[PDB]
C-alpha cells in the first residue's frame, strides 16, 4: 500500500455541484498526512474518531470522500443531526457519524472572482434526506398546496437555485470547498488501507 491519490481530490480542478456531491472511494493504499501538507490553508477541520492526520499511517477498509462546494455559513451545517437547507435537500450524514469533514475557502479555484453560477442547490422537496441519500436531478417541482403542470406554475417552484456571479460579499458567500472523509470499519481481509 503506497501513498494514496488522496491529495489529488483536495488539489483538484473540478468540484461538482452540492446537489451532485461526488462520492469517491479510496482503498488499497496508505493515506498519510505527508501526501498533502505543503499547502495547509484549510479553514476548518472536524473529526469524530481517529483520523489519517491524527495517526500518520492508519488503515481502513472503506474510505469514501464526499466532495462538493458550498458557501461559508452553511459549512456549519455539515454535521450529524443538522437541519435546514443544505442538510435537508442536498446532503445528509448519519446522526451516528464517525468520520471527518474538511472545509477550505477559495474564490479563485472556481476560475472566477465573482464566483460561479454553475454550482446549484435545491431548496425543499417535501421530506428531508435521512443519512446518505441523493434524489436531486434536473426536474420541475410539482404542486405543494395546489397542483400544476410543468414550468413555474401555480404554487410551483424550480427546485434548483443558482449562486451569485457578482463579486462576493465576504467569506460568508465565498465558495468553500468541502470534503467529508466519512469512513467505516467492517470485517474484511487486511492489506486494504485508506
Amino acid at each position, epitope marked *: 500500500t503506497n501513498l494514496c491519490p488522496f491529495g489529488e481530490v483536495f488539489n483538484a480542478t473540478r468540484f461538482a455541484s452540492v446537489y451532485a456531491w461526488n462520492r469517491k472511494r479510496i482503498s488499497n493504499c496508505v493515506a498519510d498526512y505527508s501526501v498533502l*501538507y505543503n499547502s495547509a490553508s484549510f479553514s476548518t*477541520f472536524k473529526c*469524530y474518531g481517529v483520523s489519517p492526520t*491524527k495517526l500518520n499511517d492508519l488503515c481502513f477498509t472503506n474510505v469514501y470522500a464526499d466532495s462538493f462546494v458550498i458557501r461559508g455559513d452553511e459549512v456549519r451545517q455539515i454535521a450529524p443531526g443538522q437541519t435546514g437547507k443544505i442538510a435537508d435537500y442536498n446532503y445528509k450524514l448519519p*446522526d451516528d457519524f*464517525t468520520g471527518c469533514v474538511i472545509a477550505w475557502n477559495s474564490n479563485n479555484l472556481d476560475s472566477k472572482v465573482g464566483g460561479n453560477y454553475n454550482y446549484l442547490y435545491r431548496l425543499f422537496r417535501k421530506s428531508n434526506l435521512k443519512p446518505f441519500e441523493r434524489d436531486i436531478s434536473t426536474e420541475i417541482y410539482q404542486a405543494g398546496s395546489t397542483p400544476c403542470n410543468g414550468v413555474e406554475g401555480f404554487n410551483c417552484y424550480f427546485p434548483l437555485q443558482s449562486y451569485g456571479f457578482q463579486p462576493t460579499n465576504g467569506v460568508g458567500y465565498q465558495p468553500y470547498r468541502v470534503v467529508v472523509l466519512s469512513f467505516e470499519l467492517l470485517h474484511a481481509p487486511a492489506t486494504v488501507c485508506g
Partner: nanobody
Amino acid sequence: HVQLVESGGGLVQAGGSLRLSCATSGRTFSTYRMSWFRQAPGKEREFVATIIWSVGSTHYADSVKGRFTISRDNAKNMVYLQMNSLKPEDTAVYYCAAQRSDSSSWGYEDDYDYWGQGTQVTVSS
C-alpha cells in the same frame, strides 16, 4: 448529535472548592478538544480554560491560572473543571464546549462547534 450535560456548581463561599462536571454524549468523544467558557450577564461567552487532548496541553485564563484545573476522561466520556479557592469574579454561567480536532492546528476555539446548556456558579465573598 452532541449533547453536553452539566452537573455540580451552585452557591459556594469565596475560597472554597468546587467541581464542575460535564458529561458528553457524542460519537467517539475521545477525539475532541475541551474548553470551559463562562458568560456573565450582558457579556459574550469568554475563555476560562482549555485542554488539547492530542498533546496533553492545558491553557488557563490568566485570572484563574494556577488555581483551576481542567481535565478530561475518555473512558467515562467526561470532562471536569476543579476550581480551587474561587473568587467573586468566577460567578457566571459556565459552559463546557467540545471542539473538533485531528487537524493541521490544535487551537480551535474560533470555530465554535457546540457547547453545553450551562450551569450557574455563584461565589459569595
